Amino acid sequence: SMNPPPPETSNPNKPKRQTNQLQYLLRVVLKTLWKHQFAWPFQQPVDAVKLNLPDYYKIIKTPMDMGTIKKRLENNYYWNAQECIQDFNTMFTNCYIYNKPGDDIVLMAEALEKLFLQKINELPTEE
Ligand SMILES: CC(=O)N1c2ccc(-c3ccc(C(=O)O)cc3)cc2[C@H](Nc2ccc(Cl)cc2)C[C@@H]1C
């Protein structure tokens, strides 16, 4: 089977900006999660060819990963923090939906999600 193309990371038809909250999401939140020992499976799109999981993209039609989120932040793709936070949650939700409750990857996602929530709890005021 084949992989789908990755989620778009820059769209010339879609308005772009930077906010101090989106800066915090890249510089503090994503940066902290990216170098966690459990981050690596989430640093790029799920590769259903490499993993030989032809049902992954039958079940998950809105994939998301931290590599995509990082690129989106780098490209000012998000207009606000809520769009970025939603993508992080889509990434976690996809993981919990596809994988079984006791799987290594689920425990890894749960650890990253706990840390994510700790970090976004101090999202700064908009300047
Ligand atoms: C995110 C998610 O739900 N899944 C996922 C995604 C990517 C990779 C993965 C990523 C990169 C490599 C690699 O660089 O070789 C290998 C596997 C693996 C997985 C998950 N598998 C897995 C991850 C970690 C450990 Cl310790 C054991 C099994 C399955 C799942 C589809």
Among candidates 35, 17, 26, which has minimal Cα distance to 69?
Answer: 26
Ligand 1 centre to CA of 43 (Å) is 10
User: Ligand 1, closest atom to CA 42?
Assistant: 1
Pocket test for ligand 1, best of 33, 98, 105, 112 (most atoms within 8 A of CB): 105
Q: Which residues of 87-122 are buried (b: 16+ CB within 10 A; e: fewer)?
A: bbebbbbbbeebbeeeeeebebbeebbebbeebbee
Ligand 1 centre to CA of 109 (Å) is 11
Q: In units of Å, what resolution does this entry have?
A: 1.6
Of 3.40.640.10, 1.20.920.10, 1.10.10.10, 3.40.50.10260, the CATH number of 19-123 is 1.20.920.10
